[PDB]
Amino acid sequence: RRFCHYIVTMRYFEVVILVVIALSSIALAAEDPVRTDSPRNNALKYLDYIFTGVFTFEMVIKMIDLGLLLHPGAYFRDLW
Ligand SMILES: CC(C)CCC[C@@H](C)[C@H]1CC[C@H]2[C@@H]3CC=C4C[C@@H](OC(=O)CCC(=O)O)CC[C@]4(C)[C@H]3CC[C@]12C
Structure with a gap:
């Protein structure tokens, strides 16, 4: 299944991740602190x-x- 994982990350997946990031940032900017x-x-x-x-x-x-x-070269090898 690791080849499937490799191919999923290339199937226009970065653009979907960026869209999710942007929409969630707007969602954070839309909260009501007081109510x-x-x-x-x-x-x-x-x-x-x-x-x-x-x-x-x-x-x-x-x-x-x-x-x-x-x-x-794996996970946790980057601070990101
Ligand atoms: C290049 C990047 C940095 C663009 C940044 C734009 C957005 C991060 C910010 C700019 C002003 C924000 C808006 C300012 C406050 C409103 C009202 C807020 O609630 C309401 O619609 C009022 C009605 C109610 O309170 O029930 C909903 C989100 C919204 C549109 C915010 C959505 C996110 C916004 C667009």
Whole structure:
């Protein structure tokens, strides 16, 4: 399945990741600090669920494809 992981990251995947990043940044900029229970916060929290799911899916794909700290050139070998 590692070849599938390699091919998924190339199937226009960076653009989708960037779109998710931008939309989640706008979602962060749209929160209401003072009204902690207003419906806007309720919608943005669902948006945050979606963005968290997408990001953790990408992170798991990266773990599987590149491998953990066991060797250089893998996950945790970058601060990013
Ligand atoms: C090149 C990059 C840095 C562009 C940056 C643009 C956005 C990061 C910022 C600029 C001003 C922000 C907006 C300022 C406050 C509003 C109102 C906010 O809530 C409302 O619509 C008011 C109605 C209500 O409170 O119920 C929704 C998000 C929004 C559009 C924000 C969306 C994100 C915005 C567009």
